[PDB]
Coordinates of C-alpha atoms and ligand atoms in Angstrom, one line a residue:
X1 CA -0.1 -0.1 0.0
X2 CA 1.2 3.6 -0.6
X3 CA 3.2 5.4 3.0
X4 CA 0.7 8.2 2.4
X5 CA -2.4 9.5 0.9
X6 CA -2.8 13.5 0.3
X7 CA -5.9 15.1 0.3
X8 CA -3.6 18.8 -1.1
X9 CA -4.9 20.6 2.3
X10 CA -0.9 22.3 3.3
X11 CA 1.7 21.5 6.0
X12 CA 1.3 24.2 7.6
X13 CA 3.8 26.2 10.4
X14 CA 2.7 27.2 14.1
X15 CA 4.6 29.8 13.8
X16 CA 7.1 32.6 12.1
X17 CA 9.6 29.8 10.3
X18 CA 13.3 31.7 9.7
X19 CA 15.3 30.0 6.9
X20 CA 18.7 32.5 6.6
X21 CA 21.2 32.1 9.8
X22 CA 20.5 34.5 12.1
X23 CA 23.0 37.3 12.8
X24 CA 24.3 38.6 16.4
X25 CA 27.7 40.8 17.2
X26 CA 28.9 37.4 17.9
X27 CA 28.6 35.7 14.9
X28 CA 31.2 36.4 12.8
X29 CA 34.0 35.4 15.7
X30 CA 32.7 31.6 14.6
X31 CA 31.7 31.5 11.1
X32 CA 31.7 33.8 7.8
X33 CA 29.7 32.2 5.1
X34 CA 26.8 32.6 6.3
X35 CA 24.4 31.9 3.3
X36 CA 25.8 28.3 3.9
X37 CA 23.3 27.9 6.7
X38 CA 20.3 27.4 6.8
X39 CA 17.0 26.6 8.4
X40 CA 14.3 23.9 6.9
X41 CA 11.0 25.2 6.7
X42 CA 7.2 24.0 6.2
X43 CA 8.4 25.7 2.5
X44 CA 9.7 23.1 1.4
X45 CA 7.3 19.8 3.0
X46 CA 6.0 19.4 -0.5
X47 CA 8.9 18.3 -1.9
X48 CA 10.2 16.0 1.2
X49 CA 6.2 14.6 0.6
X50 CA 7.1 13.4 -2.7
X51 CA 9.8 11.2 -1.2
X52 CA 8.2 9.8 1.2
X53 CA 5.0 9.1 -0.2
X54 CA 5.2 5.3 -2.7
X55 CA 4.1 2.2 -2.6
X56 CA 5.2 -0.6 -0.3
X57 CA 5.6 -4.5 -1.2
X58 CA 6.6 -7.3 0.8
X59 CA 7.9 -10.7 0.0
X60 CA 8.5 -12.6 3.6
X61 CA 10.8 -15.6 3.0
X62 CA 11.7 -18.7 5.7
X63 CA 14.5 -16.5 7.2
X64 CA 12.3 -13.8 8.6
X65 CA 10.1 -15.8 10.0
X66 CA 13.3 -18.2 11.7
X67 CA 14.6 -14.7 13.1
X68 CA 11.0 -13.3 14.4
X69 CA 11.0 -16.7 15.9
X70 CA 13.9 -16.2 17.9
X71 CA 13.1 -12.5 18.8
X72 CA 10.0 -13.8 20.2
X73 CA 11.8 -16.2 22.1
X74 CA 13.6 -13.7 24.1
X75 CA 11.3 -11.3 23.9
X76 CA 8.7 -13.8 26.0
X77 CA 11.5 -13.8 28.7
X78 CA 10.8 -10.2 29.7
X79 CA 8.5 -9.2 32.1
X80 CA 7.2 -4.8 31.7
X81 CA 5.3 -2.9 34.3
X82 CA 2.9 -0.7 33.7
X83 CA 3.8 3.1 35.0
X84 CA 1.4 5.1 36.9
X85 CA 0.0 8.7 35.9
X86 CA 2.1 10.4 37.8
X87 CA 5.4 8.3 36.4
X88 CA 4.2 8.6 32.9
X89 CA 3.6 12.9 33.8
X90 CA 7.3 12.9 35.3
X91 CA 9.1 11.7 32.1
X92 CA 6.9 14.5 30.4
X93 CA 9.6 17.3 28.6
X94 CA 8.5 20.8 29.9
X95 CA 8.5 22.2 27.2
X96 CA 6.6 19.4 25.2
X97 CA 3.5 20.9 22.5
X98 CA 0.1 21.1 24.5
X99 CA -2.9 19.2 24.5
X100 CA -5.5 20.4 22.2
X101 CA -8.0 19.6 25.2
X102 CA -7.1 22.7 27.6
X103 CA -3.6 21.9 29.1
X104 CA -0.1 22.0 28.6
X105 CA 3.3 20.1 29.5
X106 CA 3.3 22.4 33.0
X107 CA -0.2 21.2 33.7
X108 CA 0.9 17.4 33.5
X109 CA 4.1 17.7 35.3
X110 CA 2.2 19.5 37.3
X111 CA -0.5 16.6 38.2
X112 CA -3.5 19.0 37.8
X113 CA -6.9 17.6 38.0
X114 CA -7.9 18.6 34.8
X115 CA -4.8 17.0 33.0
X116 CA -4.7 14.0 35.3
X117 CA -8.5 13.7 34.7
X118 CA -8.5 13.5 31.2
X119 CA -5.5 11.4 30.7
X120 CA -7.9 8.9 32.7
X121 CA -10.2 9.5 30.1
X122 CA -8.2 8.7 27.1
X123 CA -6.6 5.7 29.0
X124 CA -9.5 4.9 29.4
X125 CA -11.3 5.3 25.8
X126 CA -8.0 2.9 24.8
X127 CA -9.4 0.5 26.6
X128 CA -13.2 0.4 25.5
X129 CA -12.3 1.3 21.8
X130 CA -9.4 -0.7 19.7
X131 CA -10.4 0.3 16.3
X132 CA -11.1 4.1 16.1
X133 CA -8.0 5.7 14.6
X134 CA -6.1 8.1 16.2
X135 CA -5.3 11.7 15.5
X136 CA -2.0 13.0 14.8
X137 CA -0.9 16.5 13.6
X138 CA 1.8 16.6 10.9
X139 CA 4.7 19.4 10.8
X140 CA 7.6 20.4 9.1
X141 CA 10.7 20.4 11.0
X142 CA 12.9 23.2 11.5
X143 CA 16.9 22.2 11.1
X144 CA 19.8 23.6 10.8
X145 CA 22.0 22.2 8.1
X146 CA 25.4 23.3 5.4
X147 CA 24.1 23.8 2.0
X148 CA 25.6 20.7 0.8
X149 CA 26.2 21.4 -3.4
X150 CA 27.0 17.9 -4.2
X151 CA 23.7 16.6 -3.0
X152 CA 21.2 19.1 -4.8
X153 CA 21.7 22.2 -2.7
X154 CA 19.3 22.1 0.5
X155 CA 17.4 19.6 2.1
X156 CA 14.3 19.4 2.1
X157 CA 12.5 19.7 5.3
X158 CA 11.7 16.3 7.4
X159 CA 8.3 15.5 8.7
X160 CA 6.9 14.6 12.1
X161 CA 3.6 13.2 13.0
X162 CA 2.8 13.0 16.7
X163 CA -1.0 12.0 18.7
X164 CA -2.3 14.8 21.4
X165 CA -0.5 14.9 24.6
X166 CA -2.8 13.3 26.8
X167 CA -2.2 10.6 24.2
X168 CA 1.2 10.7 24.6
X169 CA 1.1 10.6 28.8
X170 CA -0.7 7.1 27.9
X171 CA 1.9 5.6 25.3
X172 CA 4.1 5.9 28.5
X173 CA 1.7 4.2 31.0
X174 CA 1.8 1.6 28.8
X175 CA 5.2 1.0 26.7
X176 CA 7.8 3.0 28.5
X177 CA 9.1 0.3 30.2
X178 CA 8.4 -2.0 27.7
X179 CA 10.4 0.2 24.7
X180 CA 13.2 0.9 27.7
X181 CA 13.9 -2.9 28.1
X182 CA 12.7 -4.9 25.5
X183 CA 15.6 -4.0 22.9
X184 CA 18.6 -5.0 24.7
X185 CA 16.9 -8.7 25.3
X186 CA 16.0 -9.4 22.7
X187 CA 18.9 -8.1 20.6
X188 CA 21.8 -8.5 22.8
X189 CA 25.1 -6.4 22.1
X190 CA 23.7 -5.8 19.0
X191 CA 21.3 -2.8 21.1
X192 CA 23.3 0.7 19.9
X193 CA 21.6 2.4 22.6
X194 CA 23.0 0.7 25.5
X195 CA 26.6 2.0 24.9
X196 CA 27.9 5.1 25.2
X197 CA 29.8 6.7 22.6
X198 CA 33.3 5.3 24.2
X199 CA 31.3 1.6 25.3
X200 CA 29.7 1.5 21.3
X201 CA 34.0 2.1 19.9
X202 CA 34.7 -0.2 22.0
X203 CA 32.0 -2.6 20.8
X204 CA 32.7 -1.8 17.3
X205 CA 36.3 -2.6 18.2
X206 CA 36.1 -5.6 20.0
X207 CA 33.8 -6.7 17.3
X208 CA 36.6 -6.3 14.2
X209 CA 38.8 -8.0 16.2
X210 CA 37.1 -10.5 16.9
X211 CA 36.7 -11.6 13.1
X212 CA 39.3 -13.5 11.5
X213 CA 39.5 -11.4 8.0
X214 CA 37.1 -8.2 9.0
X215 CA 35.2 -6.9 6.8
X216 CA 32.0 -3.8 7.5
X217 CA 29.1 -1.9 6.0
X218 CA 27.0 0.5 6.6
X219 CA 23.7 0.5 5.2
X220 CA 21.4 3.2 4.7
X221 CA 18.0 2.4 4.0
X222 CA 16.0 5.0 1.8
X223 CA 13.4 7.0 3.8
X224 CA 13.0 4.1 6.6
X225 CA 9.9 5.4 8.3
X226 CA 7.9 5.5 5.3
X227 CA 9.4 1.8 4.1
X228 CA 7.8 0.3 7.4
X229 CA 4.8 -1.7 6.3
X230 CA 1.5 -2.7 8.6
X231 CA 2.8 -5.9 8.5
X232 CA 5.6 -4.6 10.2
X233 CA 4.3 -2.9 12.8
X234 CA 2.1 -5.9 13.7
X235 CA 4.9 -7.6 14.0
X236 CA 6.2 -5.2 16.1
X237 CA 3.3 -5.7 18.5
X238 CA 3.4 -9.3 18.9
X239 CA 6.8 -8.8 20.2
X240 CA 5.6 -6.6 22.7
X241 CA 3.0 -8.9 23.3
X242 CA 5.3 -11.9 24.0
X243 CA 6.5 -10.1 27.3
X244 CA 5.2 -11.2 30.8
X245 CA 2.3 -7.8 31.0
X246 CA -0.3 -7.0 33.1
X247 CA -3.4 -7.3 31.2
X248 CA -4.4 -3.5 31.1
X249 CA -1.8 -3.6 29.7
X250 CA -1.8 -5.5 26.8
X251 CA -5.3 -3.8 25.6
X252 CA -3.0 -0.6 25.9
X253 CA -1.0 -1.8 23.8
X254 CA -3.4 -3.5 20.7
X255 CA -5.1 -0.3 21.3
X256 CA -2.2 1.6 20.2
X257 CA -0.9 -0.7 17.7
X258 CA -4.7 -0.4 15.8
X259 CA -5.4 3.2 16.2
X260 CA -2.5 4.6 15.8
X261 CA 0.9 3.0 15.0
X262 CA -0.1 1.5 12.2
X263 CA -1.4 4.3 11.0
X264 CA -4.1 7.2 10.9
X265 CA -5.4 10.9 9.4
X266 CA -3.1 13.8 9.3
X267 CA -4.4 16.7 10.4
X268 CA -2.3 20.4 10.1
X269 CA -1.4 22.5 12.5
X270 CA -4.5 24.7 11.1
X271 CA -6.6 21.7 11.6
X272 CA -7.4 20.6 8.1
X273 CA -7.1 17.0 7.3
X274 CA -4.4 16.8 5.1
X275 CA -4.4 12.7 4.5
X276 CA -3.7 9.1 5.7
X277 CA -0.3 7.2 6.9
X278 CA 0.2 3.8 6.3
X279 CA 3.1 4.0 7.5
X280 CA 5.6 4.7 10.5
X281 CA 4.6 7.9 12.5
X282 CA 8.0 9.8 13.5
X283 CA 6.7 11.0 16.4
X284 CA 5.5 8.3 18.8
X285 CA 7.4 7.0 21.9
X286 CA 7.1 3.0 19.9
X287 CA 9.3 4.9 16.8
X288 CA 12.8 3.9 18.1
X289 CA 12.4 0.7 19.3
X290 CA 10.0 -0.6 16.2
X291 CA 12.5 1.2 13.9
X292 CA 15.4 -0.8 15.7
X293 CA 13.7 -4.3 16.0
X294 CA 11.9 -4.2 12.2
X295 CA 15.3 -3.1 10.9
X296 CA 17.5 -5.7 13.3
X297 CA 14.8 -8.0 12.2
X298 CA 15.1 -7.7 8.2
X299 CA 19.0 -7.6 8.0
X300 CA 19.5 -10.6 10.6
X301 CA 17.0 -12.5 7.8
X302 CA 19.0 -10.7 5.0
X303 CA 22.1 -12.0 6.3
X304 CA 21.3 -15.7 6.0
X305 CA 19.6 -15.1 2.9
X306 CA 23.5 -13.1 1.8
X307 CA 25.3 -16.3 3.4
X308 CA 27.3 -13.4 5.3
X309 CA 29.5 -15.4 7.5
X310 CA 30.0 -14.4 11.7
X311 CA 27.4 -11.5 11.6
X312 CA 27.6 -8.9 14.5
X313 CA 25.2 -6.2 13.7
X314 CA 24.5 -2.8 15.8
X315 CA 21.5 -1.4 15.4
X316 CA 20.2 2.4 16.5
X317 CA 16.5 2.3 15.0
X318 CA 17.2 2.5 11.6
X319 CA 21.0 3.1 11.7
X320 CA 22.7 -0.5 10.3
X321 CA 26.1 -1.4 10.6
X322 CA 26.9 -4.7 10.1
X323 CA 30.5 -6.6 10.7
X324 CA 31.8 -10.2 9.5
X325 CA 34.3 -12.6 8.5
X326 CA 35.5 -11.8 4.9
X327 CA 35.3 -14.5 2.5
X328 CA 36.9 -12.4 0.1
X329 CA 37.3 -8.9 -1.7
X330 CA 34.8 -10.3 -5.1
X331 CA 32.8 -13.1 -2.4
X332 CA 31.8 -10.2 0.2
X333 CA 31.1 -7.6 -2.9
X334 CA 28.4 -10.1 -4.2
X335 CA 27.5 -10.9 -0.9
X336 CA 26.4 -7.2 -0.1
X337 CA 24.5 -7.5 -3.4
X338 CA 22.5 -10.3 -2.2
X339 CA 21.7 -8.9 1.5
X340 CA 20.8 -5.5 -0.7
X341 CA 18.5 -7.2 -3.0
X342 CA 17.0 -9.1 0.7
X343 CA 16.8 -6.0 2.6
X344 CA 14.6 -4.7 -0.8
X345 CA 12.2 -7.8 -0.9
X346 CA 11.6 -6.8 3.0
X347 CA 10.5 -3.7 1.8
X348 CA 14.1 -1.9 3.1
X349 CA 15.5 -0.9 -0.4
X350 CA 19.2 1.1 0.0
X351 CA 19.3 5.0 -0.6
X352 CA 23.1 4.9 -1.1
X353 CA 24.0 1.4 -2.4
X354 CA 26.0 -0.3 0.8
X355 CA 29.5 -0.9 0.3
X356 CA 32.0 -3.5 2.2
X357 CA 34.9 -1.9 3.9
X358 CA 37.8 -3.2 5.4
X359 CA 39.0 -0.4 7.3
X360 CA 37.2 0.1 10.4
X361 CA 37.6 3.9 10.5
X362 CA 35.9 4.1 6.9
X363 CA 32.8 3.2 8.5
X364 CA 30.1 5.8 9.0
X365 CA 27.6 4.5 11.2
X366 CA 24.7 7.2 13.2
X367 CA 26.7 9.8 11.0
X368 CA 29.9 8.8 13.3
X369 CA 33.2 7.0 12.7
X370 CA 36.0 5.6 15.2
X371 CA 39.3 7.2 14.8
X372 CA 43.2 7.0 16.5
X373 CA 44.0 9.7 19.3
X374 CA 46.8 9.3 22.3
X375 CA 46.6 9.8 25.9
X376 CA 49.1 11.5 27.9
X377 CA 50.9 8.0 28.4
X378 CA 51.6 8.6 24.6
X379 CA 49.0 5.3 24.3
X380 CA 47.2 4.7 20.9
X381 CA 43.4 4.9 21.7
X382 CA 40.3 5.2 19.8
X383 CA 37.5 7.3 20.3
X384 CA 34.2 8.2 18.7
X385 CA 34.3 11.2 16.3
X386 CA 32.3 12.8 13.0
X387 CA 32.3 15.5 10.5
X388 CA 32.0 18.8 12.2
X389 CA 29.7 20.5 9.5
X390 CA 26.3 20.5 10.5
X391 CA 27.4 20.6 14.4
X392 CA 29.5 23.8 13.7
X393 CA 26.5 24.9 11.2
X394 CA 24.0 24.5 14.5
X395 CA 26.3 26.2 16.9
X396 CA 26.3 29.4 14.3
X397 CA 22.5 28.9 14.5
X398 CA 22.7 28.9 18.2
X399 CA 24.8 31.7 19.0
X400 CA 22.6 34.1 17.9
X401 CA 19.4 33.0 18.3
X402 CA 18.3 31.2 21.5
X403 CA 16.7 27.5 20.4
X404 CA 14.5 25.0 22.3
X405 CA 17.3 22.3 21.8
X406 CA 20.4 23.3 22.5
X407 CA 22.8 21.2 19.9
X408 CA 26.1 22.6 20.6
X409 CA 26.1 21.6 24.2
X410 CA 24.9 17.9 23.8
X411 CA 27.6 17.7 20.4
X412 CA 30.3 18.7 23.3
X413 CA 28.8 15.5 25.6
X414 CA 28.5 13.3 22.6
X415 CA 32.2 14.3 21.1
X416 CA 34.0 15.5 23.9
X417 CA 37.1 13.8 23.0
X418 CA 37.6 15.2 19.7
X419 CA 39.3 17.6 18.1
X420 CA 36.6 19.7 17.0
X421 CA 34.5 19.8 20.2
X422 CA 37.6 20.3 22.3
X423 CA 38.7 23.3 20.4
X424 CA 36.3 25.2 18.6
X425 CA 32.5 24.1 20.6
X426 CA 33.9 24.4 24.2
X427 CA 35.7 27.3 24.0
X428 CA 33.2 29.0 22.0
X429 CA 30.3 28.4 24.4
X430 CA 32.3 29.2 27.8
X431 CA 33.6 32.1 25.7
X432 CA 29.4 33.5 25.3
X433 CA 28.2 31.9 29.3
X434 CA 31.5 33.4 30.8
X435 CA 30.0 36.9 29.2
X436 CA 26.5 36.7 30.3
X437 CA 27.4 34.7 33.4
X438 CA 25.2 32.5 32.5
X439 CA 27.5 28.5 33.9
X440 CA 25.1 28.0 36.0
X441 CA 22.2 28.3 33.8
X442 CA 20.7 24.6 33.1
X443 CA 20.3 23.8 29.1
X444 CA 18.1 21.3 28.0
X445 CA 19.7 19.2 25.3
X446 CA 19.1 16.0 23.2
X447 CA 21.0 12.5 23.9
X448 CA 20.1 9.4 21.8
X449 CA 16.1 11.1 21.9
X450 CA 15.5 11.9 25.6
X451 CA 15.9 15.7 26.6
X452 CA 18.3 16.0 29.1
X453 CA 18.5 19.6 31.4
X454 CA 22.2 20.2 32.5
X455 CA 24.2 23.0 33.9
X456 CA 27.5 23.3 31.8
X457 CA 29.1 23.5 35.3
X458 CA 28.1 20.0 35.2
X459 CA 30.1 19.0 31.7
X460 CA 34.1 18.0 34.1
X461 CA 32.3 15.7 35.5
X462 CA 29.8 14.4 32.4
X463 CA 32.6 14.0 30.7
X464 CA 34.9 12.4 32.7
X465 CA 31.9 9.2 33.9
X466 CA 31.2 9.0 29.8
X467 CA 34.3 9.3 28.6
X468 CA 37.3 8.7 31.3
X469 CA 40.0 11.0 32.3
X470 CA 41.7 10.5 29.4
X471 CA 39.3 13.4 27.3
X472 CA 40.9 15.9 28.4
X473 CA 44.0 14.5 27.3
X474 CA 44.1 13.1 23.6
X475 CA 46.4 14.4 21.0
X476 CA 48.4 13.7 17.8
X477 CA 45.3 13.3 16.2
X478 CA 45.3 11.5 12.9
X479 CA 46.4 13.5 9.7
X480 CA 42.6 12.3 7.9
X481 CA 41.0 13.3 11.2
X482 CA 42.7 16.4 11.3
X483 CA 42.2 17.6 7.8
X484 CA 38.6 16.8 7.6
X485 CA 38.3 19.3 10.5
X486 CA 40.7 21.9 8.9
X487 CA 38.8 22.0 5.6
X488 CA 35.7 21.9 7.4
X489 CA 36.7 25.2 8.4
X490 CA 37.8 26.7 5.1
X491 CA 34.5 25.6 3.9
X492 CA 32.3 27.4 6.2
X493 CA 35.0 30.1 7.0
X494 CA 35.3 29.7 10.3
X495 CA 38.8 30.6 12.3
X496 CA 41.6 28.2 12.0
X497 CA 42.4 25.8 14.9
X498 CA 45.7 28.2 16.0
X499 CA 43.0 30.8 16.5
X500 CA 40.8 28.7 18.9
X501 CA 43.8 27.7 20.7
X502 CA 45.1 31.3 21.4
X503 CA 41.1 32.1 22.5
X504 CA 41.0 29.0 24.7
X505 CA 44.1 30.5 26.4
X506 CA 41.8 33.3 27.9
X507 CA 39.0 31.4 28.5
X508 CA 40.6 29.2 30.3
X509 CA 42.3 31.8 32.5
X510 CA 38.9 33.7 32.5
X511 CA 37.3 30.0 34.2
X512 CA 40.3 30.0 36.2
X513 CA 39.7 33.3 38.0
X514 CA 36.6 32.7 39.0
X515 CA 37.4 29.7 41.2
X516 CA 34.9 26.7 42.4
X517 CA 33.4 24.7 39.2
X518 CA 33.6 27.6 37.3
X519 CA 37.6 27.3 37.8
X520 CA 38.1 23.2 37.8
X521 CA 36.0 23.6 34.0
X522 CA 39.0 25.9 33.1
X523 CA 41.6 23.6 34.4
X524 CA 40.9 20.0 33.0
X525 CA 38.2 21.0 29.7
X526 CA 41.2 23.6 28.3
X527 CA 44.3 21.4 29.9
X528 CA 45.0 21.1 25.8
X529 CA 45.4 24.8 25.3
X530 CA 48.6 25.3 27.9
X531 CA 52.3 24.5 27.0
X532 CA 52.8 22.8 30.5
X533 CA 50.2 20.8 31.1
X534 CA 49.0 19.8 34.7
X535 CA 48.6 16.6 36.5
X536 CA 44.8 16.0 36.0
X537 CA 42.8 14.1 38.6
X538 CA 39.6 12.5 39.4
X539 CA 36.8 15.1 40.0
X540 CA 34.8 14.1 43.5
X541 CA 26.0 12.3 39.9
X542 CA 23.0 9.6 38.9
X543 CA 23.6 8.4 35.3
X544 CA 20.3 6.5 33.8
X545 CA 21.6 8.0 30.4
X546 CA 22.6 4.9 27.1
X547 CA 19.7 2.5 27.8
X548 CA 17.5 3.2 25.1
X549 CA 16.9 5.4 22.2
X550 CA 13.4 7.8 22.5
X551 CA 13.5 9.3 18.9
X552 CA 10.8 11.7 18.7
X553 CA 9.2 9.7 21.9
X554 CA 8.6 13.1 24.0
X555 CA 10.6 11.9 26.9
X556 CA 12.1 14.4 29.7
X557 CA 14.8 13.1 32.1
Ligands
885_601 C1 28.0 10.0 19.2 C2 26.6 9.9 18.6 C3 25.5 10.5 19.5 C4 24.5 10.7 19.4 S1 23.4 12.2 19.9 O1 24.8 13.4 19.9 O2 22.3 11.5 21.1 N1 22.3 12.6 18.6 C5 22.9 13.2 17.3 C6 22.6 14.6 17.5 C7 21.1 14.6 18.1 C8 20.8 13.4 19.0 C9 20.2 12.2 19.2 O3 19.6 11.1 18.8 O4 19.2 12.7 19.8 C10 23.6 9.5 18.5 N2 22.5 9.4 18.2 C11 24.5 9.0 18.3 C12 25.9 8.2 18.3 CL1 26.7 7.0 17.6

């Protein structure tokens, strides 16, 4: 069936949308090529609609079924709990979109009687009705990128489809525990979201080593959400249903599946019917877990069809990477063809054809790749990095405009060991925080789809716990990484690293003069900017981070 059916009504914005990079007095210090940065708007919704609207056909064989039976077997060992209303409420983001029934995220977090009462009615309705399609709002996402000449210029906005706040709280009650625990049990070490960036690197490295003659490839399916069929979504539900669940949760999960996850009508911000959906909704609690399960199932079955030996996979939603025993350059390239053919049969055709790789560092998954640097003792060490183009473009935007999500902070946290994050991101933003005296001001960022509220003064401890003390001492990066960064800076008109090192000394001195937690930031985050280093000793914090992905899941911590 068709992924979507449209009425003709436009995807409308809910507020004024900016497309050009906002500019203030701080802009030029970071980036000069302003015309290269842009944000997507509803204005390009039509283009996206065309890319994501197509017919899906599925041909399921024994390998698919065999894999599924195995997945259900592990799933049946899972026991999930129903979340109370108060519990679900506290998982709601302070700035989550308000309900159309008279209450917002604040009312939900405070457990207002109005909010709580409506939630109870929605829940009761889920239990009493398993057939009425639930409404959803389709919106065009506003995201910042750098123009990509060798791609088509600018990317059209991505679409987000989500149900009302009341329904969103109900999803949490019925499936938060499920989507938080099931994946790791079913997929084991292949479930990507259970790792911090350092553990991810470690798992890729040990997996690569575990093979006599390693070979790996990333597999990117075209518009994964749109390739997800009704069958896929019902298979996802049969898996959830394998868990030891409370009778009330089974009914709720069956209801949400039939009424929301399988598909439903699309309404714009103006309240007009835009059409109907028959594929994965990007804005529901099961988006990450569902995509991950479906991707793991199709790829695992595809590996058997292609006869790839000793296949170890790493899955993060729709992002797939596979490492296995090479049977030879020629044999490997042939297998990939079969793999891709099977994936296609399963309704997961490729965007960019997959290609075998024999150098772990040349594989990009989740927009990242492993690279090498050296620690204090001079030891060779691996860490996760990525092309800094998008992170820098977003930093530029956030430099002049406050946003709901601070990507620079999320990036410093996730890529703390990187050359670009340490020299540019940290230097630039701490300078800004210093000038405004907002070092102690908590900021919202996003990690694995979940929203976290974090004080930059806490960066030192956060980084140490996540990446180890070594993150404050890496040096001698690879020529490849150095050149990618230096090249990206010229592309965007960003001052060269030598300028950043000079600025860091100042920011460092400034942080030190303020003593306390600020000084710790200066001492640890910027020890790389001094000629003669300090010792750097552990720093004298709850982390329920890195357990599951919640992209588009409306989750807060
Ligand atoms: C290193 C890394 C970082 C992120 S993240 O920084 O948590 N991510 C990318 C930017 C937005 C954010 C998210 O997924 O919420 C993700 N998803 C995957 C990997 Cl392998």
